[PDB]
Paper text:
GapN catalyzes the irreversible oxidation of glyceraldehyde 3-phosphate (G3P) to 3-phosphoglycerate (3-PG) while reducing NADP+ to NADPH. As S. pyogenes lacks the oxidative part of the pentose phosphate pathway, GapN appears to be the major NADPH source for the bacterium. The GapN-monomer from S. pyogenes, like its counterparts from other organisms can be subdivided into three domains. The monomers assemble into a tetramer displaying D2 symmetry which is formed by two interlacing dimers with dimer-dimer contacts primarily mediated by the protruding domain, while contacts within each dimer are formed by a β-sheet of the protruding domain interacting with a β-sheet of the catalytic α/β domain via salt bridges as well as α-helices (residues 232–251) of the Rossmannoid fold of each chain.
To further characterize the function of the S. pyogenes GapN and provide a starting point for future screening campaigns, we determined the crystal structure of the GapN by molecular replacement using the apo-form of an S. mutans tetramer as a search model. The structure revealed a covalent modification of the enzyme at the active site residue C284, which could be modeled as β-mercaptoethanol although this compound was not present during purification. Hence, the enzyme must have been modified following heterologous expression in E. coli. Determination of the crystal structure of the S. pyogenes GapN apo-enzyme revealed an unusual cis-peptide in proximity to the catalytic binding site. In all chains of the wild-type and C284S variant a cis-peptide was observed while only half of the chains in the reference structure from S. mutans were modeled in the cis configuration. Considering that the formation of a cis-peptide outside an X-P (X denoting any amino acid) peptide is rather rare, the electron density maps of our structures and the published structures were critically examined. This analysis confirmed the formation of a cis-peptide bond in both S. pyogenes as well as in S. mutans. As this peptide bond is within 11.2 Å of the active site, it might be relevant for the proper function of the enzyme.
Author numbering:
A (entry chain D), B (entry chain C): 1 to 475
C (entry chain A), D (entry chain B): 2 to 475
Amino acid sequence: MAKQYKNLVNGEWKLSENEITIYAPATGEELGSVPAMTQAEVDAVYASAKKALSDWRTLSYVERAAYLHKAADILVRDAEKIGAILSKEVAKGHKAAVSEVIRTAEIINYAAEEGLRMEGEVLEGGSFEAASKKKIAIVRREPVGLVLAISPFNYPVNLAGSKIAPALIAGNVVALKPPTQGSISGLLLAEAFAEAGIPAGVFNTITGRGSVIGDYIVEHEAVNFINFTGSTPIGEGIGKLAGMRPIMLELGGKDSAIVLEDADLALAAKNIVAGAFGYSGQRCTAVKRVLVMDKVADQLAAEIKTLVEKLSVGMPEDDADITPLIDTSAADFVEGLIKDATDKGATALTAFNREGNLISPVLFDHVTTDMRLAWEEPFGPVLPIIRVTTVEEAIKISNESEYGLQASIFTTNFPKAFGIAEQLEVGTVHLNNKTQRGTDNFPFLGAKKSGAGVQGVKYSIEAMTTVKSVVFDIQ
Amino acid sequence: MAKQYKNLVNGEWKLSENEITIYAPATGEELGSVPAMTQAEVDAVYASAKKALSDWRTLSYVERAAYLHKAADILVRDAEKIGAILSKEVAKGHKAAVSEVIRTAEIINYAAEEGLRMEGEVLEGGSFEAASKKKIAIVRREPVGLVLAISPFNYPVNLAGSKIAPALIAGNVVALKPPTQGSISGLLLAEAFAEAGIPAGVFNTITGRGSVIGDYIVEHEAVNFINFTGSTPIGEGIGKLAGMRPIMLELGGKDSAIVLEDADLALAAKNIVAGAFGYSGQRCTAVKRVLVMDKVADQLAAEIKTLVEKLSVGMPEDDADITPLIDTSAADFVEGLIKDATDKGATALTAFNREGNLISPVLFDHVTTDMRLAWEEPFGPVLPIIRVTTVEEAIKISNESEYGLQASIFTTNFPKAFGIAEQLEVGTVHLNNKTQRGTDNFPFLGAKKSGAGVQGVKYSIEAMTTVKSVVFDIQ
Amino acid sequence: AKQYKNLVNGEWKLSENEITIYAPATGEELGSVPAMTQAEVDAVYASAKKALSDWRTLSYVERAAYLHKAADILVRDAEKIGAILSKEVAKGHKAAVSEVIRTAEIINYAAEEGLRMEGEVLEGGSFEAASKKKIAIVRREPVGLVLAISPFNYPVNLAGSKIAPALIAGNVVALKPPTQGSISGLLLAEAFAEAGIPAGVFNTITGRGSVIGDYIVEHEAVNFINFTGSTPIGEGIGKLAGMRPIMLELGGKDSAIVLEDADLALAAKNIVAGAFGYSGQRCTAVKRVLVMDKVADQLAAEIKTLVEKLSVGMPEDDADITPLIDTSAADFVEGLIKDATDKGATALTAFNREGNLISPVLFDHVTTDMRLAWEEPFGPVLPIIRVTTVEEAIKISNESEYGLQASIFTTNFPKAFGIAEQLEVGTVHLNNKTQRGTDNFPFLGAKKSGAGVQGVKYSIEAMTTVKSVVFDIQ
Amino acid sequence: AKQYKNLVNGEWKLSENEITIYAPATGEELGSVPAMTQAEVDAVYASAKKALSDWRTLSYVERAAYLHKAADILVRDAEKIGAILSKEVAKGHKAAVSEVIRTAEIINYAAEEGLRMEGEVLEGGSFEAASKKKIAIVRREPVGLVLAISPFNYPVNLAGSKIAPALIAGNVVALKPPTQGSISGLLLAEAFAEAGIPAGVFNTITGRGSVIGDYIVEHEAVNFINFTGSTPIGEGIGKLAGMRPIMLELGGKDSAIVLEDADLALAAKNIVAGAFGYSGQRCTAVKRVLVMDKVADQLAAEIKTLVEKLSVGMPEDDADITPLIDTSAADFVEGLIKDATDKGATALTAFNREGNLISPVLFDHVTTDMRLAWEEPFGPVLPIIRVTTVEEAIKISNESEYGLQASIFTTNFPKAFGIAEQLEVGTVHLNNKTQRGTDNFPFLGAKKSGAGVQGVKYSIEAMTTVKSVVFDIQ
């Protein structure tokens, strides 16, 4: 039942002297163990990847795309088998975990076909000066080299594949460092690439304790690019450890949902509840605060309340909407935000209840900017409603956040919604819909402390490629 | 005629309590003084810029382009006046300094017209999944915010304008930090933008001592992007101080010129000498080592020697090819590399002579890779010739360098030259021509320790812009 | 009244015969233009094909410099050119000067858009592994000789919108202005000649359609025909072009769909400005209002009050409604007004005609059996058609043989976008009148409204081809 | 020998009359195809216009899935389709199977290229400050009904290269294969029908040119004609199209310019493979060698040795030179051989004809007064023309009415690029024979060789239009 998992290192499956046992956050069930790599074993992974780089980058785009398509087919075949373990490993609903594996296969296939249509440009010297009119630049794309991909606990397969496939199609070699709570899933994803016959050293995995290899994996001079999803403080550290090297960071969010007086309140409540409470609010791109005009606030709060009361609260195996949080510390942190809001006079529209790390969904009304819940990312099923008098106030409060991932605007006036969107300091603005990363072909980025670089399949490919210009004179 | 220069801060010209006197490196003549800003004065510059940002980004592209065109016209008008001071300030030939100011005006005009044709994209949700076929993403470009532009001593006007105009057209606000040896020229460039009527706070300058404001200007939370040209160690430090913030770094080069057996040796010698000895070798994109096939090495060295002996050695006012180096430390460093090469048995084809900081051009043959001159960037008029037996050896020696700015290949076999170019770890490869940044519409980038990001007018605009996606469903 | 000459191979040439041009509003003689023979058209094309090799080999910067100098000369002489243009096509004095300034803007924008011309590098390895070392260096090239045919209503603006995009790309051009508008077209040519455009690179042709009409188009020297004018002439040009590339800007019957939730005052303001601009003598003009019956009475009343305010008079007095281009045009418009009156449409503003000066006529209760519901008048007459559903509005809008542009006045934009997807038009304007601008935007027509896509960058792409150079890397 | 049917609105239909098809190499009866009437063509087009709305509103992913499913069926049945295709157009068995596999590759590539279709957002503030709040959301759209006309020499490959790019973009298609090749076109249609392509989305038309030839092109339901075939037929299609968009892939007389510094063995190998592939029945074949006199004797001797090694025989034996498509084609080739012999050209390989199987003829000392220097033979005959300067080679190359592709064999690449700029062709191959591939690369012809740019992404762009939605941000 509980297997001893191994790392993919240069086409071989390796155990380490020490290991980390992984337990199901909802039940405490032992799921297996992953290797606890040393720095010398991380060196072996990077040496194998740099050695494999020359033969991988010289393959055709077609040949590289064929491996990715083969990996995605194996993921679709084993979606139930991987989804069942993923569900237990990060306390995600069984169906939602299987959906994550299917979405990963879709992103791998889309990146394989997006990346193979890689084009260059021909520039004319005569565009700038007459004397150089016979000079042209043949500009072609090249891989950056070794990409270190760091996936998060909440999407350990999906936000590993969204980094791996775009890097691999471009001719880069990859080392996946999954989170410890999610490493069995990351290694199951690696088994699909290994079964697809990915050449030795082109795709590898690293698992271990942050105290032994956390900074080491990023600082290493073999790494040419770091692609990470995780907390803002960890991302801030990765940015300095990267030095001059290119990075892509997907960090926290405190996405606001601005509801104007002319909004469809039932549609706004439906989207706000689905977005805020999806995976018990353990998503960076979740709706984390409602900024509603006071005229429609009482009716909107009542409609959000009725929907929050319907949400099922239970175990991942029963596909509950609200499942247990990733760990005790996460649950304690969420309870502290709920306590601060209650003590400062916010109205609890739905009751707080906690059984283990299973916190019931809490909706708060009359939330003010002096409450921690107005600003701090909970990663838990708690949503504040902050009443505003003007749209200028809603923009001001929205932009006062250190985060700027996405925003939602619920209104029937789209020219005004576009004007508001221009002023919001976020990557994406959704009109009459919850904030969301999808569709995966769209750009996904965060302003301020929410990230660095632009994600979305083609943008991820462009970010993990460089340019080689060949200039010559026509005679 | 030594003037007391002032910094452009929020539409006003400000002196500081302390100042730095600038002297001509070739004669020791006092040229004037620039303010020695405090950290509180840097805070005032950044506060002015962030305040000016909202009204600047909301202007049309046409309005922003008009200011850039007006400033470029003022630079063309005052090219002799600016060029005369620039020549004395960095010991650059009088005509070459005037040419630099004219080239700056050309880049400003090209960036104003490139940036105003800024386009977005419309993506279809139906490209990724059938359920999202009515969902579209209107993706538009936005400024990153405040750009800190740091120009180098060797191109204090040209590599200030190449950062300022692309940032300004995109709707960013700028703070120019010129080098101390080059700050009078950076402030003369600022006077052209001020005379063009650039709004208060949109364009500002900072001058000061590295011990007082060096790290402070970069670390400051108001700065959203750092665009720097200078030494590799300084750029490495900037990368760390930037944290997660976007950067563009133009650092050192050790550009190799690979000469094959079928090369036109007279053309190779002409290009190699013009590129290696331009501005006494004080350029990052300059031929710094010749990797020549042994069969043609004696004839190529003889042809390079005859041309190096013709180079004039003297003062900037007399438009000498070889002028005095930027400072004593730079000339001492170059002399040390010449000494190491002589002591290790390299053949000096042209004699070493030094008068103050005026070093005569030294050509070395039979340079082996145990010599410091084979690897270290001198920033002086010294060129090694390294003989090889195979093109595999030339590629291996060229790639062993920590730098990878550009490379030159002299050969009549272009399909082979393209194959070699693919293997060279550089940004740009010039076929049958010296390495060069131009034309300014072409990408300019460095692999390895030569930089971060892609320069060239459109690439600079793209780098200093982000994306704002607005997603909605069609009904 | 001067005797104008054609620009042919850097020289100014008269022909044996000439055509005298009169002001449509006053009958004043403005001058004459040459009446070229087919042999003189041959000389223009021989000059252009000879000049093509040295023009296409110039840098993009050198070609852009000539365009910028021509645009500067147009700005300098905008009052001088605009004054003659105003008299020549009975356009308001200020509107005619604005047209010359807008032409200089398009020329400059084309010069800077075209010089940033880029190619592409394609990888053989994208399609098959065996061709991974094979790449294609794809670069843009001119099509060759472009014949540009401008219309009477925009004889300078819709001549420059064809000439500058063609010239920046390395093409040589022959401008054939309309006879009523040839003095303006030749004044535009004087600006390019003063800018020092090389001999044969830019030339003009003037003459009678019965002598050279089909001849200029069917000539084998012409590689591309870029025309603005009537649909029947455009249809003929398409056949005469054979396999050669074309760009056609033809008739319009633009609809303004007004929904129940629309801002009716804003809809009326935009509808009147768009429908009655230059007395309705524009292809991109609101030519039919398709309004929901619940809001039709109030919209009709608001359009009426604004139509009654429009000044009716002479071009020199900057009147909103000026005399029509010719008697035939005014007779045709009067016939459409008569047909609507006889079929029971309600004339909300009175019909009056003094010479070829027709007062603006607004009709309500227009049905699909009336000619005014379908035919392009090119006159100051606007029908209002009442509809019960948006499906009916889409159906009636698409039943037209034209599909240039449409306007949708509503506060529901997701629905407006859904309606826009169903309309068979090139452009849909939300809460605004139909318009060609801004000139960087695409401008095209579906069905009988055109062929090809205009707008500066689109015009450049259309009048260029590609040259692919393929080789294997070793 | 089966009785084949046309795919019409999801049903397989016979016509009252039929055309029996015979193998050009053996005379074997292969089956019959319907001889459609104009009323049956009307039914095909009515079905397609009706199916257009539900096809275009499907997602790109759903349209791509049908194309991928059709391509998989073609790979599965590649031997079955290839065996019939080989007999139908006297193409080698292995080459005919390869054609089906290449068609599946193009269908898959077009499905994935087309689904990443993007629009653009343009800023009014790029052109004028007053329009800075105005933006244009420009999205791609199908042109409507595409009539695809495939040629006899690539009846499956140059049917799929038109069908898949049109279908992914949301267009509906009617395939008109050539009569000699209609069984193969209908076998391709069976793969799309088995893939479950919706009724009316994809249809076929078969018939006699005297009954429906002009009718299929003239029909007002057709919005785009994509044709590969002879130049005179293409010229007629261009007129019949009127203002409607077209894509024409017509004749070629591709020149292979061999300079003094060329690798003559490489030049001979590529020249012979390109000139004699499918007995020279290809528009992209090398059809004339323009060689510098200093290296002409050695090059001709090297080409001769390779031509003498070409097998001459039947398609079932994978012979290099197989029987020509029909008697008329072989008679025409024999006439060009006769004109060259009578005018003094040197026959380096002997002329022999057995039925319509012509042996490969190599001619040297071919002059510009011989028909073989200019006319496309579509037969295994190649002239070698000697030139004294590269200027003469460019002049002779460009004197041709065709301009499909050119080859340049030389070791001086910067000079080869300079020559390529002067050649009036779509593509120039350096040190390699002319060829359409890879299918992601642009494929086009200058002068009488075509209209429009083919190659997968270029095909998709050509069979799409643009819909601009403009609004002001508040």
